[PDB]
Design a protein around this ligand. Sequence first.
Ligand code: ZN
Ligand code: ZN
Length: 88
Amino acid sequence: GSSGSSGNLDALREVLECPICMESFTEEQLRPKLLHCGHTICRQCLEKLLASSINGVRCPFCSKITRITSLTQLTDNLTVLKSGPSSG
Ligand SMILES: [Zn+2]
Ligand SMILES: [Zn+2]
């Protein structure tokens, strides 16, 4: 058993975490990727989608096919890795 923390606490605005799995963007594994739309998702989630897709990945948010054969092709999202937010 492991638990014990305070709830009803939400201050962070940035999306340092994935809007899907909600896991801290960790280069080691979960690498933050930016779609041609703007939304940021961890390569992990993007992979599950790309796998099937062939002519681009369909964003589960806006649904903007990301014509990219490789995970690096799309727009990189190092903003989450950078120290703090980029734009306020
Ligand atoms: Zn994810
Ligand atoms: Zn999107």
